[PDB]
Amino acid sequence: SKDPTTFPLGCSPDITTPKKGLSMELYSYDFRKKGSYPCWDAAYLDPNYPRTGYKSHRLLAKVDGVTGNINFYYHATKGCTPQLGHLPASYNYPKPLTMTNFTMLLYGYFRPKVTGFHTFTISADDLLFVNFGAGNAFDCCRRDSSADHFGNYQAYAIWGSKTAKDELTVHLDAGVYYPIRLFYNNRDNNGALSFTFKTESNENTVSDFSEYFFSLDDTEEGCPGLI
Numbered sequence: 001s002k003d004p005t006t007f008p009l010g011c012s013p014d015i016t017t018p019k020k021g022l023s024m025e026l027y028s029y030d031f032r033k034k035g036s037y038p039c040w041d042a043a044y045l046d047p048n049y050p051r052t053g054y055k056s057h058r059l060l061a062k063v064d065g066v067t068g069n070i071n072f073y074y075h076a077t078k079g080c081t082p083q084l085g086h087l088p089a090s091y092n093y094p095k096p097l098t099m100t101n102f103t104m105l106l107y108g109y110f111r112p113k114v115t116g117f118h119t120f121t122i123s124a125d126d127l128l129f130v131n132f133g134a135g136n137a138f139d140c141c142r143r144d145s146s147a148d149h150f151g152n153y154q155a156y157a158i159w160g161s162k163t164a165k166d167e168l169t170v171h172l173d174a175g176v177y178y179p180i181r182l183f184y185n186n187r188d189n190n191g192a193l194s195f196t197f198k199t200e201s202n203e204n205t206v207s208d209f210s211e212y213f214f215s216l217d218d219t220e221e222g223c224p225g226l227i
């Protein structure tokens with residue numbers, strides 16, 4: 001199914017070794033013309049923006065190997081102004097960009113170290129939408145064929161809501177590879193992203209996904225979860 005669940009389906013890759021990290025795509029996201037009220041564009045909140053809307057914007061980059069700690073907080077000096085900044089080294093993107101106003105997509109697989117309930121906690125300024133699980137995010141080693149067909153969000157955080165924070169609790173199996181999609185936007189001013197998790201297994205919070213995030217090439221037959 002494509003719907004969100006407490007028991008997402010995962011994937012079992014064959015020989016070809018998973019590559020470390022997620023793939024990232026960076027897109028432009030403009031302010032409105034000077035004098036507009038507000039200065040920022042609300043286009044990022046169109047329900048189709050994370051499916052088809054972002055594609056109409058300028059592609060800035062596509063990179064592989066995104067892993068480690070992917071959290072960031074970018075302090076702008078003021079609102080309504082394009083300002084330059086850099087993503088954390090973990091994003092494997094060494095060029096400056098308009099950190100005040102941009103859209104970013106991350107996708108790949110999450111591999112647990114434990115079998116049991118995982119709670120992922122997210123926050124964002126302005127927006128982080130998470131899909132998680134086969135179908136919900138995308139199909140097992142059939143991502144290109146299924147990437148636009150993601151289902152309802154497992155978790156989402158929008159700056160301006162009560163909390164700007166959400167959680168996803170899911171039962172996962174260790175060593176299985178779960179499709180994951182993160183969709184981020186900054187419309188104006190400061191920008192933030194937090195993505196961490198805990199499990200029933202202990203009281204450690206994971207912020208560094210060096211051993212958790214992976215990429216698998218698509219295959220003829222796909223790589224459906226065998227366990």
Ligand SMILES: OC[C@H]1O[C@@H](O[C@@H]2[C@@H](O)[C@@H](O)O[C@H](CO)[C@H]2O)[C@H](O)[C@@H](O)[C@H]1O
Binds near residue numbers: 040
């Ligand atoms: O604080 C993060 C938040 O800032 C937003 O802009 C604010 C806006 O809420 C306001 O009242 O005006 C000031 C002008 O400097 C500005 O701080 C922004 O639109 C959001 O995306 C958040 O980043």
Ligand SMILES: [Ca+2]
Binds near residue numbers: 125186188
């Ligand atoms: Ca912002």
